[PDB]
XYZ file of N, CA, C and O in Angstrom:
664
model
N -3.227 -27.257 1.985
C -2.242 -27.013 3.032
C -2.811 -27.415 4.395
O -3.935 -27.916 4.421
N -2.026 -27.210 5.692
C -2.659 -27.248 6.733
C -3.980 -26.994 7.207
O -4.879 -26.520 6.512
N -4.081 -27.342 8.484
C -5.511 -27.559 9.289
C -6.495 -27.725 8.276
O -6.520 -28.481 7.305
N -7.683 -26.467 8.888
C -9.034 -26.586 7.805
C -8.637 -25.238 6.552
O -8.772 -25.272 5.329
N -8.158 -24.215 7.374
C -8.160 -23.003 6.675
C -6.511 -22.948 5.259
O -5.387 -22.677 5.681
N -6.650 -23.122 4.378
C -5.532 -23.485 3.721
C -5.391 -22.297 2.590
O -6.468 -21.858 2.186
N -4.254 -21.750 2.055
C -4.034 -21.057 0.694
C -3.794 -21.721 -0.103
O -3.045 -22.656 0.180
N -4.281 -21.599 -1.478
C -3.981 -21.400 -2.242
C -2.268 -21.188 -2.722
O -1.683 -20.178 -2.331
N -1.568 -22.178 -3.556
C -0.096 -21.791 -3.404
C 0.377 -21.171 -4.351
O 0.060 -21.902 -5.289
N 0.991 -20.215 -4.834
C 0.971 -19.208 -5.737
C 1.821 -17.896 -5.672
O 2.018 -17.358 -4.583
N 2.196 -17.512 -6.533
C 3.035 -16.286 -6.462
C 2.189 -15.213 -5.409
O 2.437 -15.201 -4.203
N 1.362 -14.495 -5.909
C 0.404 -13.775 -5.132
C -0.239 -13.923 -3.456
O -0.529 -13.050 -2.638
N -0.294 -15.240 -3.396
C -0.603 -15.816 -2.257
C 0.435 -16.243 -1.617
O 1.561 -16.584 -1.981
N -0.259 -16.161 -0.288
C 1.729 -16.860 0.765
C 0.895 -18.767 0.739
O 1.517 -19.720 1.207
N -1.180 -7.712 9.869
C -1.704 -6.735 11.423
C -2.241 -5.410 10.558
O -3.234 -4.727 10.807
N -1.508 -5.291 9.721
C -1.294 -4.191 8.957
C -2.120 -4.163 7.402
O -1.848 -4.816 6.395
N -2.837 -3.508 7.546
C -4.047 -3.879 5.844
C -4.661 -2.271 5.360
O -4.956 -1.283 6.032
N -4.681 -2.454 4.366
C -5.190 -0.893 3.569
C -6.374 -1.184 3.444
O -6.689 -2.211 2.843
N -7.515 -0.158 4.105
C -9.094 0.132 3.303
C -9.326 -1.237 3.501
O -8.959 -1.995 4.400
N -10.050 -1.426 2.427
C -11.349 -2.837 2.190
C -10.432 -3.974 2.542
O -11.117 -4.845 3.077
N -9.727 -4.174 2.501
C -8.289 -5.571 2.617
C -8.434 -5.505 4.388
O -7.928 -6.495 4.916
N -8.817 -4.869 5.006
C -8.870 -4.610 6.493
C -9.123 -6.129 7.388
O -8.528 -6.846 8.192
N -10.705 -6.044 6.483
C -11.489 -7.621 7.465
C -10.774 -8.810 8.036
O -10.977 -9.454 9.066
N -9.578 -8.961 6.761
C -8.905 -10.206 7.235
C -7.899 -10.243 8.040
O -7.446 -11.350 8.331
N -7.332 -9.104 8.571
C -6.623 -8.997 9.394
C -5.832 -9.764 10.325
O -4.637 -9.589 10.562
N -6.807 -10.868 10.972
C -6.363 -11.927 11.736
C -5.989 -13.250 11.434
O -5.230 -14.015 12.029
N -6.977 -13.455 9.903
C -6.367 -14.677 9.407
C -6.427 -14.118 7.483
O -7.440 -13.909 6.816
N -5.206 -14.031 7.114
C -5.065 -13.529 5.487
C -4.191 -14.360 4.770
O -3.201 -14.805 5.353
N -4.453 -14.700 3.329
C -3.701 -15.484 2.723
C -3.011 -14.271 1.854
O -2.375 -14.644 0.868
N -3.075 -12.683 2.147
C -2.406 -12.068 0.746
C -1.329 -10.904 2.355
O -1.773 -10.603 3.462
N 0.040 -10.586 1.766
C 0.434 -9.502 2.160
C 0.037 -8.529 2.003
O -0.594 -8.253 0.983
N 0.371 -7.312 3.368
C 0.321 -6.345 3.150
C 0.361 -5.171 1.288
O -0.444 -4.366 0.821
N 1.273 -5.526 0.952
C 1.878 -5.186 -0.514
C 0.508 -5.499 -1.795
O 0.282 -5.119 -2.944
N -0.055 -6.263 -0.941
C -1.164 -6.923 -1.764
C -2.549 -6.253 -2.096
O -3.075 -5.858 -3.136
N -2.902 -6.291 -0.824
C -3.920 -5.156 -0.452
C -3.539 -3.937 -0.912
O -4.341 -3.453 -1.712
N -2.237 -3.047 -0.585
C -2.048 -1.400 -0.635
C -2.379 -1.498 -2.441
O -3.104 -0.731 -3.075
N -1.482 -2.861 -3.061
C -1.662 -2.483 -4.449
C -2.705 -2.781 -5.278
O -2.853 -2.267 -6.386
N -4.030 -4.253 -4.389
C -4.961 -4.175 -4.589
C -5.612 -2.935 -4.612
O -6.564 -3.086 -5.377
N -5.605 -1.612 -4.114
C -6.510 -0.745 -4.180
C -5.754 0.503 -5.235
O -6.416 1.539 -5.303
N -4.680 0.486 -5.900
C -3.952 0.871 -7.168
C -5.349 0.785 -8.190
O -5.250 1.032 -9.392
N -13.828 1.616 -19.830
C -14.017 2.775 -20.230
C -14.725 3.600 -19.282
O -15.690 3.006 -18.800
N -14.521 5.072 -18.752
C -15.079 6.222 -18.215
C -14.964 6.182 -16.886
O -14.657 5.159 -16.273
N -15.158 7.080 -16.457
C -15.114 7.034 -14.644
C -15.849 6.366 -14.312
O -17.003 6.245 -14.722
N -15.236 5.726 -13.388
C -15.967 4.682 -12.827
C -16.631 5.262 -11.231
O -15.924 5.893 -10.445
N -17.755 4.997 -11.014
C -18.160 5.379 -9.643
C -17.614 4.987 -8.044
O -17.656 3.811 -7.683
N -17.315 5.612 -7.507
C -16.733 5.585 -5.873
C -17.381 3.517 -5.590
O -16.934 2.380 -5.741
N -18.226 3.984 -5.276
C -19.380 2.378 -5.201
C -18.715 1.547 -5.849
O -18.027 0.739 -5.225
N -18.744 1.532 -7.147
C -18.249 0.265 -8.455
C -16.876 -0.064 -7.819
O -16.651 -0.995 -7.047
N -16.124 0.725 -8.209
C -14.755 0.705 -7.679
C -14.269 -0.259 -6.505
O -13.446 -1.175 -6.495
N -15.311 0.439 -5.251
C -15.318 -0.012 -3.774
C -15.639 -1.263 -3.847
O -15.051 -1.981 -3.038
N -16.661 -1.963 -4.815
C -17.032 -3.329 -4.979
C -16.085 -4.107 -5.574
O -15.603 -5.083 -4.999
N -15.695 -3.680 -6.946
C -14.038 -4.430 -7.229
C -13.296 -5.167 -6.494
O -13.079 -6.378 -6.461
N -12.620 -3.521 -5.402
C -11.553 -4.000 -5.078
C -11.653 -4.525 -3.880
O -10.573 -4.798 -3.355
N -12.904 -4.826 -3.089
C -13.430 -5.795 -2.346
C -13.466 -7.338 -2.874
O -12.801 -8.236 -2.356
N -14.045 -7.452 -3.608
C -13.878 -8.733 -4.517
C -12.332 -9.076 -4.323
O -12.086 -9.861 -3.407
N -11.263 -8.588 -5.066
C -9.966 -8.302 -4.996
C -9.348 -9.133 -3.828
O -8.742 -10.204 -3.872
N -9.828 -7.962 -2.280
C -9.857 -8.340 -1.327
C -10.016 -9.838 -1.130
O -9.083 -10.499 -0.674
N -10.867 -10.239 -1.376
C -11.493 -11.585 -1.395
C -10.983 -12.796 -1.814
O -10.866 -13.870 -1.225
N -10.638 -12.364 -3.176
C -9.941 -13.407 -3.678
C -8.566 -13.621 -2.770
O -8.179 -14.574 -2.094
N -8.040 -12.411 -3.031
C -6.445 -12.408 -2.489
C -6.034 -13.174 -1.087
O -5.369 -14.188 -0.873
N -6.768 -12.183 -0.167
C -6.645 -12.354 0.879
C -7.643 -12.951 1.488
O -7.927 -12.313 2.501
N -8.277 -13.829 1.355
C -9.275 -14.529 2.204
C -9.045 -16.186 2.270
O -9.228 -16.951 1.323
N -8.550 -16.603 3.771
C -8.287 -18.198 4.143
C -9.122 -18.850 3.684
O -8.647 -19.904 3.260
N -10.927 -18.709 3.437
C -11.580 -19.295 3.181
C -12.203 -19.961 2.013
O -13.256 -20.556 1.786
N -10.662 -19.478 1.074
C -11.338 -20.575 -0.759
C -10.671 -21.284 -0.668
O -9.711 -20.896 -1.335
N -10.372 -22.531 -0.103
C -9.817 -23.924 0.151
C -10.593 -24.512 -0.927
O -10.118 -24.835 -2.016
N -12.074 -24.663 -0.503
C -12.724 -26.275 -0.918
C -12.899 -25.880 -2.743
O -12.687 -26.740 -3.598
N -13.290 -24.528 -3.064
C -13.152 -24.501 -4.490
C -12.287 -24.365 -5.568
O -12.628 -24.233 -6.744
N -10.469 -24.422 -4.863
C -9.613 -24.478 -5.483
C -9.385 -25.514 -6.646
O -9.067 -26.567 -6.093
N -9.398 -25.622 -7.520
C -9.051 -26.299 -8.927
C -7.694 -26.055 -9.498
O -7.552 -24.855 -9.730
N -6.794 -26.669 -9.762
C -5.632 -26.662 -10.711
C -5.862 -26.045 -11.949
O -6.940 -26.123 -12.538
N -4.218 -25.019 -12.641
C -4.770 -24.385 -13.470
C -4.624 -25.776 -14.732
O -5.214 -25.656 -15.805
N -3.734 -27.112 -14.409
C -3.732 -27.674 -15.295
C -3.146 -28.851 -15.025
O -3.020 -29.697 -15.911
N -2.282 -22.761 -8.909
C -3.709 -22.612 -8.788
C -4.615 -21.523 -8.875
O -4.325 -20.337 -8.716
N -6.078 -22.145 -9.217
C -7.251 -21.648 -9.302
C -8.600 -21.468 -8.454
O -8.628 -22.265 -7.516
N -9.777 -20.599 -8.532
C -10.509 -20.741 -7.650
C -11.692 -20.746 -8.915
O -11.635 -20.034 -9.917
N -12.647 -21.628 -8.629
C -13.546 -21.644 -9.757
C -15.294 -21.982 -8.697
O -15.658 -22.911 -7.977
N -16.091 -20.370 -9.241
C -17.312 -20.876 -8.518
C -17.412 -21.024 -7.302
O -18.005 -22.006 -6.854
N -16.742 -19.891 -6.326
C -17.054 -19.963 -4.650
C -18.797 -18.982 -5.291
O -19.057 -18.181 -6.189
N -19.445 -19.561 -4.370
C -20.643 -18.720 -3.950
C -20.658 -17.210 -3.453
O -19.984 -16.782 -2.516
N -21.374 -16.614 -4.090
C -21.509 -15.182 -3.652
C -22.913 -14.903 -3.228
O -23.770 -14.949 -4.111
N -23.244 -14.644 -2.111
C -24.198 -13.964 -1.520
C -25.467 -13.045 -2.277
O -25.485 -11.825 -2.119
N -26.246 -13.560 -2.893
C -27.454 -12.867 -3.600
C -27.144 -11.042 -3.751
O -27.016 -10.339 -4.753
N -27.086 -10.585 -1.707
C -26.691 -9.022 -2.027
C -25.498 -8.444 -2.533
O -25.333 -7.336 -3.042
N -24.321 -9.784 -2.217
C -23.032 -9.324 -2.914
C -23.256 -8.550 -4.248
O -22.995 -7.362 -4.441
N -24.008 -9.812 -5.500
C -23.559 -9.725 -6.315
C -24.906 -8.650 -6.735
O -24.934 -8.297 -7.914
N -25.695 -8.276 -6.071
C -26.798 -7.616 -6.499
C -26.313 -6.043 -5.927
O -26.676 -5.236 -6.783
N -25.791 -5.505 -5.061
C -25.119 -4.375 -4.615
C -24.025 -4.081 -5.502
O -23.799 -2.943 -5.912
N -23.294 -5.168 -5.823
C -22.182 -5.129 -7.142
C -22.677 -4.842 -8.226
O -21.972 -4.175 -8.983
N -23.956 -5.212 -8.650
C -24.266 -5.175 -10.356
C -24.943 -3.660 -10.166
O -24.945 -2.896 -11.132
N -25.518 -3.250 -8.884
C -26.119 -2.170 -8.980
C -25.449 -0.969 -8.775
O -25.926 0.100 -9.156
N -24.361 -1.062 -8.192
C -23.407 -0.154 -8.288
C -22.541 0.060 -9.575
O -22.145 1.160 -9.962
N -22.342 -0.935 -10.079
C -21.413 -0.910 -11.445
C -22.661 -0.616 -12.414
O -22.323 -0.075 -13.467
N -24.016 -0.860 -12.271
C -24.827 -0.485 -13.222
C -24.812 0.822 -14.522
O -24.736 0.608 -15.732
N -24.910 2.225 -13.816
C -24.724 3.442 -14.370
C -23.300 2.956 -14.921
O -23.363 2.800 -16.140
N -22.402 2.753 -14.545
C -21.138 2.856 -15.196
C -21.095 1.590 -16.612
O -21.768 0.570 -16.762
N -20.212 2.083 -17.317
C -19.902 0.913 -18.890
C -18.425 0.407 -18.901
O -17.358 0.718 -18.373
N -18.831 -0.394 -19.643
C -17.068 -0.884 -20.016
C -17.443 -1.607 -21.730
O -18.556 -1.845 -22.201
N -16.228 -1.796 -22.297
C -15.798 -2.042 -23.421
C -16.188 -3.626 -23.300
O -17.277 -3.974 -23.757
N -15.294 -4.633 -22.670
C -15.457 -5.631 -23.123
C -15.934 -6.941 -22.078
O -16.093 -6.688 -20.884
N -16.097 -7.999 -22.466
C -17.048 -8.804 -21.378
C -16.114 -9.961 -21.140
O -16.601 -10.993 -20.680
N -14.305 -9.880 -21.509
C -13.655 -10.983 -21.040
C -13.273 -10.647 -19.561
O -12.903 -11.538 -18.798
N -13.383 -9.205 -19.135
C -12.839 -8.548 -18.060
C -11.409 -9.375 -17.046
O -11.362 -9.502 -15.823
N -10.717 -9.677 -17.744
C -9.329 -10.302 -17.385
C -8.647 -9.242 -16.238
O -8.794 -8.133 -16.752
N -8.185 -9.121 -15.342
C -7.865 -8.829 -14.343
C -7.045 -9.158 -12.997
O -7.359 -9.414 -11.834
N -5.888 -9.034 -13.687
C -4.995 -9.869 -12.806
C -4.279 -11.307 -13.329
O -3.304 -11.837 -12.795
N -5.069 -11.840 -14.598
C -4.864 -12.597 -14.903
C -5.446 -12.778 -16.801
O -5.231 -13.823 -17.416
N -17.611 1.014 -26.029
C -18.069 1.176 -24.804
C -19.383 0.801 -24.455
O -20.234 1.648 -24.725
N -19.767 -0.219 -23.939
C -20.965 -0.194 -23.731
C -21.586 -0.186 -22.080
O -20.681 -0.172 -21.245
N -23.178 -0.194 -21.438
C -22.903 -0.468 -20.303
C -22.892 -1.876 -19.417
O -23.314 -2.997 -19.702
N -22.475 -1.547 -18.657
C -22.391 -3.416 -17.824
C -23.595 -3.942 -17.607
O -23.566 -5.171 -17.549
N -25.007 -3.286 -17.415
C -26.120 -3.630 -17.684
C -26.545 -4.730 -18.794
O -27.320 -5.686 -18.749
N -25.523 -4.074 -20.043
C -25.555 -5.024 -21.234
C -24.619 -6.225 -20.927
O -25.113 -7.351 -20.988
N -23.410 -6.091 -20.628
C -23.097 -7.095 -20.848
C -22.979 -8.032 -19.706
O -22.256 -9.025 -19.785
N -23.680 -7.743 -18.631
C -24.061 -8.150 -17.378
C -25.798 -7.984 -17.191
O -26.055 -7.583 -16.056
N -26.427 -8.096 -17.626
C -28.406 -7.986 -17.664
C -28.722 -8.369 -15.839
O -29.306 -7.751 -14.949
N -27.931 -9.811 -15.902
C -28.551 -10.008 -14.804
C -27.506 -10.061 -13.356
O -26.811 -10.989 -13.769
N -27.046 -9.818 -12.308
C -26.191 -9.981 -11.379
C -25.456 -11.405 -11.445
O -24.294 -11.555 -11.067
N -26.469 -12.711 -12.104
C -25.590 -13.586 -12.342
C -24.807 -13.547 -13.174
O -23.918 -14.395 -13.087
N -24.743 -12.402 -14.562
C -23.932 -12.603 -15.527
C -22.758 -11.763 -14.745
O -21.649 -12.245 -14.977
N -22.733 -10.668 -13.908
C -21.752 -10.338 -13.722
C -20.742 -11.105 -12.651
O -19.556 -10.777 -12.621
N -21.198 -12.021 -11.871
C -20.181 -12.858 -10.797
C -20.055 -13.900 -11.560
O -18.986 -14.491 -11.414
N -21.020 -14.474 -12.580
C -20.610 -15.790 -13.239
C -19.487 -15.325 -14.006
O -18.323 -15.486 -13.639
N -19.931 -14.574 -15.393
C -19.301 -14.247 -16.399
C -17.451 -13.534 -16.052
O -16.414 -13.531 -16.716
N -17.761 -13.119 -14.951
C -16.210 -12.085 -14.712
C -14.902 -13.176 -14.142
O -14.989 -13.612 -12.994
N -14.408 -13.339 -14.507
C -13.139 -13.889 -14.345
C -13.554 -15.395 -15.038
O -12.809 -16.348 -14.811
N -14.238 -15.498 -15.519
C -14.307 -17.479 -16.397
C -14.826 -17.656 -15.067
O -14.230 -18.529 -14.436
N -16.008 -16.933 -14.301
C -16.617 -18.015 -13.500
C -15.826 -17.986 -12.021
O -15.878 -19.117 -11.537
N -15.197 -17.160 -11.258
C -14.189 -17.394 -10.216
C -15.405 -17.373 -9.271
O -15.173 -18.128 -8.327
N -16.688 -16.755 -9.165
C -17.533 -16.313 -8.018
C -18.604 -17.490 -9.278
O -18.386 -17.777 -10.455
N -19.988 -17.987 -8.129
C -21.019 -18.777 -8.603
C -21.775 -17.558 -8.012
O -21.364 -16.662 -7.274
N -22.814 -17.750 -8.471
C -23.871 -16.630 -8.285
C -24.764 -17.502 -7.371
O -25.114 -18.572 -7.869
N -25.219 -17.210 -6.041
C -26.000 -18.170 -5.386
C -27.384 -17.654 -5.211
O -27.662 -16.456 -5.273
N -28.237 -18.603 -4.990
C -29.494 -18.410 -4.674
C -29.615 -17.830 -2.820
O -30.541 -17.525 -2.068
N -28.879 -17.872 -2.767
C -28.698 -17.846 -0.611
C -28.162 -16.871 -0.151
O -26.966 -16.577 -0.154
N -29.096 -16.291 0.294
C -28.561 -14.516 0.950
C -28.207 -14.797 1.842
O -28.340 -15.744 2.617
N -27.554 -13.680 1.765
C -26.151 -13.257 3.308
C -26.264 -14.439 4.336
O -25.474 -15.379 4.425
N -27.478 -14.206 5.159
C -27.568 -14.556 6.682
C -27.323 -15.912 6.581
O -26.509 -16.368 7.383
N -27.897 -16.761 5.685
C -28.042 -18.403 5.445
C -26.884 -18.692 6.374
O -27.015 -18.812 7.592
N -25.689 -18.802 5.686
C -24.874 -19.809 5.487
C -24.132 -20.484 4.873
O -23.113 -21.011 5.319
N -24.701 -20.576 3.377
C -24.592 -20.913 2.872
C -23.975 -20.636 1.600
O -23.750 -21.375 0.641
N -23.714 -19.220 1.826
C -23.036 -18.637 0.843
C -21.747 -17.368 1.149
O -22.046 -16.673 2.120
N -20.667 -17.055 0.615
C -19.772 -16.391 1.111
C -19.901 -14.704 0.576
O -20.199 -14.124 -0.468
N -19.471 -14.320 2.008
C -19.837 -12.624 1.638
C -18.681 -12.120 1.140
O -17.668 -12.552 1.690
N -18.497 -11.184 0.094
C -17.689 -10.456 -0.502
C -16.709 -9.665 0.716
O -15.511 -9.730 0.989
N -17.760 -8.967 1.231
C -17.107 -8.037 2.182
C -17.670 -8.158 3.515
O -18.862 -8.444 3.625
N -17.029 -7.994 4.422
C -17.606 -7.923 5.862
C -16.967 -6.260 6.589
O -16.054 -5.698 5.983
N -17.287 -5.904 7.302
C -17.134 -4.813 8.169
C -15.879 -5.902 9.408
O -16.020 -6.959 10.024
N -14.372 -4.571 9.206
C -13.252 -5.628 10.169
C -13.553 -6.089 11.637
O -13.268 -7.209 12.062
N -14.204 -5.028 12.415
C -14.687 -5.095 13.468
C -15.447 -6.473 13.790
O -15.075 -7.162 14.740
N -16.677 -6.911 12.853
C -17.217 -8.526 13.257
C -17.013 -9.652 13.104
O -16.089 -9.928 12.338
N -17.522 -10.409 13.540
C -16.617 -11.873 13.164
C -16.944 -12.067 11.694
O -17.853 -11.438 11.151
N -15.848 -13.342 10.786
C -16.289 -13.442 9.868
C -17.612 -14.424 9.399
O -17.814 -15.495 9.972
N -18.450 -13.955 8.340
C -19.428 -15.186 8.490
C -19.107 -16.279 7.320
O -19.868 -17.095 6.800
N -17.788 -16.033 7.095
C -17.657 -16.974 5.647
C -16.305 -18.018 6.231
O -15.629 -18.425 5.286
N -15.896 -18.425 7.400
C -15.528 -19.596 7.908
C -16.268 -20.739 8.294
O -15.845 -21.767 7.766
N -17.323 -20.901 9.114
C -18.079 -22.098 8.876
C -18.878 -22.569 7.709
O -19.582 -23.577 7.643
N -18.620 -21.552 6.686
C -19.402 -21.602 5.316
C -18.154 -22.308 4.572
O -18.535 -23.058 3.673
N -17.288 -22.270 4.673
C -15.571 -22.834 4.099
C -15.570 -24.499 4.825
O -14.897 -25.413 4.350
N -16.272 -24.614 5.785
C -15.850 -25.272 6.607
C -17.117 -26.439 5.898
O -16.845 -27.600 5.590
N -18.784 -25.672 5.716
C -19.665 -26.357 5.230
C -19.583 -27.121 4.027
O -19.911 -28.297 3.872
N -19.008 -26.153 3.013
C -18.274 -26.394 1.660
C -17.487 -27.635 1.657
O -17.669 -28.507 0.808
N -16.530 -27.737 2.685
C -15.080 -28.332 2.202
C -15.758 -30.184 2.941
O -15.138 -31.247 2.971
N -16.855 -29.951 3.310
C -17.341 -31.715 3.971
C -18.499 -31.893 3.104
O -18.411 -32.723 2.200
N -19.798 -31.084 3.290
C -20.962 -31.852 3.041
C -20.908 -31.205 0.987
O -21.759 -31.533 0.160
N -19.983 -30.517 0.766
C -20.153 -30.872 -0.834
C -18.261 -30.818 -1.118
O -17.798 -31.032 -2.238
């Protein structure tokens, strides 16, 4: 689509934001409706949860998965995730289990197992939608799950790095 920052075109995708859906506030590819219902085996921990539906967040509503969009035949396949993303994610979902390792979502054992390493859980979860990167947060080079709404985002010139030099 337009300029640099583009959606994704899609049923789901095209001031006001619930909880973790907050950050994007100023520039979002998901409605309101999206977010409130984005945040809709065993209990799962406050943490695990909070990491989800951040992810969620992410996918939905974030301008910045342009350059890794793929056709389903749209898709997002392999944006980069931030070393602590996916390492705060695997360690929070750690203690907790689940049943099975297609984890379809949108589309008992523990996750330790069927996730060992933080790459199996951002590679393996959705057929691959997140790449597991070698490049923490600060780089550049890789996109953060979540940001705090208040700061700027650091995953637009990283969209911007993406969509020219690869």
């Amino acid at each position: 689509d337009k300029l640099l920052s583009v959606c994704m075109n899609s049923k789901r995708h095209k001031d006001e934001l619930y909880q973790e859906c907050r950050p994007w506030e100023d520039n979002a590819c998901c409605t309101r409706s999206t977010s409130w219902e984005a945040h809709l085996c065993g209990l799962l921990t406050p943490a695990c949860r909070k990491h989800f539906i951040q992810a969620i967040c992410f996918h939905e509503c974030s301008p910045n998965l342009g350059p890794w969009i793929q056709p389903v035949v749209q898709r997002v396949w392999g944006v980069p995730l931030c070393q602590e993303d996916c390492e705060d994610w695997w360690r929070a979902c750690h203690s907790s289990l689940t049943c099975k390792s297609n984890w379809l979502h949108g589309w008992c054992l523990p996750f330790s197992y069927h996730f060992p390493t933080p790459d199996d859980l951002c590679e393996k979860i959705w057929n691959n939608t997140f790449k597991a990167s070698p490049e923490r947060r600060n780089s550049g080079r890789c996109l953060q799950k979540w940001f705090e709404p208040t700061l700027s985002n650091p995953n637009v010139e990283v969209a911007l790095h993406f969509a020219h030099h690869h």
